[PDB]
Ligand binder design. Structure first.
Ligand SMILES: CNS(=O)(=O)Cc1cc(C)on1
Length: 191
């Protein structure tokens, strides 16, 4: 969660795509899906990110639909965006013990308990929070087993980005878990 507003410059691909779906939330506009191998994944857009401006025009109060139209009607050449970094999320750094545990239970990407005298507990991890990212990789809609795999194959230090479930549920409104398994970019960023 980078403290402030940054600017990104996008460029439609050969197919006129940027790779983005956006959701209206509390009169802001927020990133709902980022597509693998897309302009939006290259420039580093993330689920949860707020779009402040599109080409210098303010997004406040737009509907998802208007946001999507604005994007279609734009000269592919160069689309600027003003981004606030994942405003609804926090990042929690934890350390695995010698058993390789951090100390929580989660179900359907949702944390549901903290284990006494874990790092998770020492670190104030919260239940009723959806796991958005692990070690900077988006994990939304992967099966629980594959999240365990990512935690299990991780270094000792584990960084998790979480979002209040009521907010999370508002963003992904009416989506299958396997929709986002398919569509959401789950790669480590290129350098
Ligand atoms: C895969 N379909 S989508 O338009 O790209 C994102 C979305 C929004 C809602 C509601 O359900 N899915």
């Amino acid at each position: 969660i980078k403290q402030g507003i940054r600017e990104v410059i996008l460029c439609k691909d050969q197919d006129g795509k940027i790779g983005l779906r956006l959701k209206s939330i509390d009169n802001g506009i927020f990133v709902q899906l980022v597509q693998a191998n897309s302009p939006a994944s290259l420039v580093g857009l993330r689920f949860g990110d707020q779009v402040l401006q599109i080409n210098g025009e303010n997004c406040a109060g737009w509907s998802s639909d208007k946001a999507h139209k604005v994007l279609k009607q734009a000269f592919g050449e160069k689309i600027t965006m003003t981004i606030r970094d994942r405003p609804f999320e926090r990042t929690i750094t934890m350390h695995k013990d010698s058993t390789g545990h951090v100390g929580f239970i989660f179900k359907n990407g949702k944390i549901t308990s903290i284990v006494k005298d874990s790092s998770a507990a020492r670190n104030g991890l919260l239940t009723e929070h959806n796991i958005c990212e692990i070690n900077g990789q988006n994990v939304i809609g992967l099966k629980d087993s594959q999240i365990a795999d990512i935690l299990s194959t991780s270094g000792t230090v584990v960084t998790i980005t979480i979002m209040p479930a009521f907010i999370f549920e508002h963003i992904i409104k009416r989506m299958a878990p396997s929709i986002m398994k398919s569509l959401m970019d789950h790669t480590i960023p290129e350098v």
